[PDB]
Enzyme design. Structure first.
Site, PDB file in Angstrom:
ATOM      1  N   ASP A 124       0.811  -1.229   0.000  1.00 45.58           N
ATOM      2  CA  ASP A 124       0.000   0.000   0.000  1.00 45.58           C
ATOM      3  C   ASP A 124       0.852   1.290   0.000  1.00 45.58           C
ATOM      4  OD1 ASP A 124      -2.268  -1.531  -0.069  1.00 45.58           O
ATOM      5  OD2 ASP A 124      -2.844  -1.149   2.020  1.00 45.58           O
ATOM      6  N   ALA A 141      -2.237   7.352 -10.156  1.00 45.93           N
ATOM      7  CA  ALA A 141      -1.959   8.614 -10.869  1.00 45.93           C
ATOM      8  C   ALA A 141      -1.145   8.364 -12.164  1.00 45.93           C
ATOM      9  CB  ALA A 141      -1.211   9.594  -9.955  1.00 45.93           C
ATOM     10  N   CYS A 164      -1.037   2.888 -12.914  1.00 49.68           N
ATOM     11  CA  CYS A 164      -1.257   2.604 -11.503  1.00 49.68           C
ATOM     12  C   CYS A 164      -2.487   3.419 -11.112  1.00 49.68           C
ATOM     13  CB  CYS A 164      -0.027   2.863 -10.621  1.00 49.68           C
ATOM     14  SG  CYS A 164       0.798   4.459 -10.873  1.00 49.68           S
ATOM     15  N   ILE A 205       2.284   7.826 -12.356  1.00 45.09           N
ATOM     16  CA  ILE A 205       3.609   8.455 -12.353  1.00 45.09           C
ATOM     17  C   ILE A 205       4.616   7.747 -11.431  1.00 45.09           C
ATOM     18  CG2 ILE A 205       2.692  10.706 -13.177  1.00 45.09           C
ATOM     19  CD1 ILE A 205       2.826  11.868 -10.248  1.00 45.09           C
ATOM     20  N   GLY A 206       4.170   7.251 -10.275  1.00 42.75           N
ATOM     21  CA  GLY A 206       5.117   6.655  -9.327  1.00 42.75           C
ATOM     22  C   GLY A 206       5.428   5.206  -9.617  1.00 42.75           C
ATOM     23  N   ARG A 207       4.499   4.310  -9.287  1.00 41.73           N
ATOM     24  CA  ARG A 207       4.731   2.882  -9.601  1.00 41.73           C
ATOM     25  C   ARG A 207       4.882   2.697 -11.106  1.00 41.73           C
ATOM     26  NH1 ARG A 207      -0.041   0.007  -6.009  1.00 41.73           N
ATOM     27  NH2 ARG A 207       0.287   1.260  -4.115  1.00 41.73           N
TER      28      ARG A 207
END
Ligand SMILES: C[C@@H]1CN(c2ncc(-c3cccc(Cl)c3Cl)c(N)n2)C[C@H](C)N1
Length: 494
Positions: free
Chosen positions: A394, A430, A428, A432-434
């Site tokens: 998470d 948004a 994911c 952008i991260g994962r």
């Protein structure tokens, strides 16, 4: 400019800086001391200092009493051009950046380094390659430049916390001195001491990954933190226009109001006529050297009102593989709507028809074999393989890269088996991260596939290249370290 970010200050120092050197509306951002991984926005208002928490667990920068952002520069640009509110509802204005003089996040600052500096410039340098290191005249600095070929050393005097090269102007910081002599180069018998680019220290031979990982793992906070924050300092070069995403008809097509696709790389949807604005999706093409088959589409998790646009995108781009890196629901919040039919079911999503042929469960992921076609056109059918990674934590990143690597290897082989497949769709919440983390690992591992272990890999160069195509690709220092660990583990199992 990103001078408003101070990497090495306490809350007490931040307060003292703003109260003695700033005015009402003065601000700065800094990493948290009370909770490493978090950030603090310190703002002067009515002669007092407010500290606002910014959280990032891997998906976006979440500002308390504010909105969600892709980068701290997009956050600062937004509020400097717009509103930010306290718990009591009062407005907090970001008017005056309080500039930092610390050179520790500069690509060219090496700190402790002997006049070693010559060895590095000889091996890796080219014409105009330069660095700044500590002097031996303690407290002073040395600017070492390569031209061609030769290496020149210019002494930097530090007198009363001002910097100079022996005469002329006295600068408030090493940054100010370097920028000046970058614009107005020092002239020797005629040699122009042009400062073209900082010396590269991040490019490594893939074989020596374990060595670099060991060095970055050491206390500088670790070397990973310092490398990551030097990459973050360069994000202000990536404030590209995101006008299309801001249009009235496109506002509710965004999961997060302020997390938008760059106009220059967004996926434009064609063949939309009753809909005035039918060309938008929150997605960007990502090319690995900036072929469609070696490219990606980075996008957000579908909203109920963007499912049809998602399938229009997949069809148009001829994408045959989808990588989903979130559960539909995490921590009780919807991250992505179910845009695919139940196993064996057939659904129409606007003009697009999708059959879920078969689902297959693996340890860390589910594979869904989908058949996508346009309604009324039988001959348009193609298989779309959806790889749904379900075990990502998470918050933060997996403790071991093995699972992600096994999943990525399978995705790569599926994509490679399909003649003229379009870009791989990665998403994911948004996007952008994962999403950025999976894409960067995939790009780096592909260099190793084609070239072998003696190839050159430069992790922040690859990230910066991906970040110029979608905002904030790779969100945190934890993901940054995870990318190094994944490349290390991939090379180790070869
Ligand atoms: C001597 C300095 C070098 N350094 C550093 N040098 C370059 C990049 C980089 C590479 C390629 C593209 C981009 Cl944008 C960047 Cl910033 C980076 N991350 N770190 C780390 C610092 C702690 N010490």
């Amino acid at each position: 400019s990103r001078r408003w970010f101070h990497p090495n200050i306490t809350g007490v120092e931040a307060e003292n800086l703003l109260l003695t050197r700033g005015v009402d509306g003065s601000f700065l951002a800094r990493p948290s001391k009370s909770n490493p991984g978090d950030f603090t926005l310190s703002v002067r208002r009515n002669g007092a200092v407010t500290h606002i928490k910014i959280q990032n667990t891997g998906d976006y920068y979440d500002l308390y009493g504010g909105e969600k952002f892709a980068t701290l520069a997009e956050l600062v640009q937004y509020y400097m051009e717009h509103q930010l509110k306290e718990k009591n509802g009062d407005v907090i204005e970001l008017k005056y950046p309080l500039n930092c003089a610390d050179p520790t996040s500069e690509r060219w600052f090496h700190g402790h380094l002997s006049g070693e500096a010559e060895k590095l410039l000889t091996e890796k340098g080219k014409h105009g390659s330069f660095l700044v290191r500590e002097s031996s005249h303690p407290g002073d600095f040395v600017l070492s430049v390569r031209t061609g070929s030769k290496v020149t050393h210019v002494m930097i005097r530090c007198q009363e916390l001002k910097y100079d090269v022996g005469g002329g102007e006295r600068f408030d910081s090493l940054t100010d001195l370097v920028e000046h002599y970058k614009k107005n180069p020092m002239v020797e018998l005629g040699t122009v001491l042009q400062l073209k680019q900082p010396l590269n220290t991040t490019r490594i031979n893939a074989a020596e990954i374990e060595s670099r990982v060991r060095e970055l793992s050491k206390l500088a906070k670790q070397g990973f933190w310092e490398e990551f924050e030097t990459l973050q300092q360069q994000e202000c070069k990536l404030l590209y226009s995101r006008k299309e995403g801001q249009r009235q008809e496109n506002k509710n097509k965004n999961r997060y109001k302020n997390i938008l696709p760059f106009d220059h790389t967004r996926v434009v949807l064609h063949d939309g006529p009753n809909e005035p604005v039918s060309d938008y999706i929150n997605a960007n093409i990502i090319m690995p050297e900036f072929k469609p088959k070696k490219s990606y589409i980075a996008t957000q998790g579908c909203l109920q009102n963007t499912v049809n646009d998602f399938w229009r995108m997949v069809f148009q781009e001829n994408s045959r593989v989808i990588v989903m890196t979130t559960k539909e629901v995490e921590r009780g919040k919807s991250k992505c709507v179910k845009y695919w039919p139940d196993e064996y079911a057939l659904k129409e999503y606007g003009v697009m028809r999708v059959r879920n042929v078969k689902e297959s469960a693996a340890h860390d992921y589910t594979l869904r074999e989908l058949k996508l076609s346009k309604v009324g056109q039988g001959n348009t059918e193609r298989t779309v393989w959806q790889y749904h990674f379900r075990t990502w934590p998470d918050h933060g990143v997996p403790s071991d890269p093995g699972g992600v690597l096994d999943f990525l290897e399978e995705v790569h082989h599926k994509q490679e088996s399909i003649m003229d497949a379009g870009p791989v769709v990665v998403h994911c919440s948004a996007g952008i991260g994962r999403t950025g983390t999976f894409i960067v690992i995939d790009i780096l591992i592909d260099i190793i596939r084609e070239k072998g272990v003696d190839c050159d890999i430069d992790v922040p160069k690859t990230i910066q290249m991906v970040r110029s195509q979608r905002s904030g690709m790779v969100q945190t220092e934890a993901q940054y370290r995870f990318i190094y660990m994944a490349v290390q583990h991939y090379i180790e199992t070869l």
